[PDB]
Design a protein around this nucleic acid. Structure first.
Length: 194
RNA sequence: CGCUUCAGCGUUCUUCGGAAUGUCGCGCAUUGGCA
């Protein structure tokens, strides 16, 4: 019952979600702007020649690095912005240590690395499996290599899967007697790993 | 000196197999993806 209380407050806060000064800030924008970024559809932020916004362009750029390079570096300078005036950039293991020396309080997150010998890093779990990236020539083709078949129809299979009633199950996955703070954490952790 | 009866009858009337098969079953260009 304790969690249900916090969730109801959490949902009540999402109902308000903004203050008087924050609201007046939104409508106080002076000039709409001539051009807008395609993905964001926002004209207030600076828009480059390729019509991508400052946030948008970094997100596209960061996409290639995340699959290739394991380490995530929260550097004061980078591609995608992060709170406390920091940035997120994917770097190699040698790039990660170089970033540590450059700026103090820099946070490093490793991806799918079970080793705990490395220090100042927290391991983050992500699913990044690409068959195209296995071969540099195939990595150039991308998904187009998948339809490349000796036999069979050249087609691209798309899978969209969701766990059934996981939101409802997470409440009811364990009996109330068995339910505990340590119990629920193991449930979420096990699902996250899979 | 010819005359008469008979003028066709009974019985098969189609049968047995194959009844479609093999090949192609959208492709390309634009959208996408990758650079």
């Amino acid at each position: 019952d304790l969690w249900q209380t916090v969730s109801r407050k959490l949902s009540d806060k999402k109902a308000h979600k903004y203050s008087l000064n924050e609201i007046k800030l939104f409508n106080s924008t002076i000039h709409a702007g001539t051009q807008e970024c395609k993905e964001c559809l926002r004209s207030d932020i600076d828009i480059s020649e390729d019509s991508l916004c400052k946030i948008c362009e970094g997100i596209i750029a960061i996409s290639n690095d995340l699959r290739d390079y394991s380490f995530f570096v929260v550097s004061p300078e980078g591609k995608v912005p992060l709170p406390r005036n920091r940035y997120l950039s994917v770097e190699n293991q040698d790039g990660a240590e170089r970033k540590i020396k450059m700026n103090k309080e820099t946070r490093i997150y490793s991806k799918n690395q079970p080793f705990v010998g490395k220090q100042l890093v927290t391991n983050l779990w992500m699913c990044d499996y690409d068959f195209s990236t296995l071969n540099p020539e195939t990595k150039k083709q991308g998904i187009a290599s998948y339809v490349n078949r000796e036999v069979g129809i050249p087609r691209l299979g798309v899978l969209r899967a969701d766990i059934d009633n996981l939101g409802t199950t997470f409440i009811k996955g364990i009996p109330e007697q068995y339910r505990s703070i340590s119990r629920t954490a193991t449930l979420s952790r096990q699902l996250s790993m899979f």
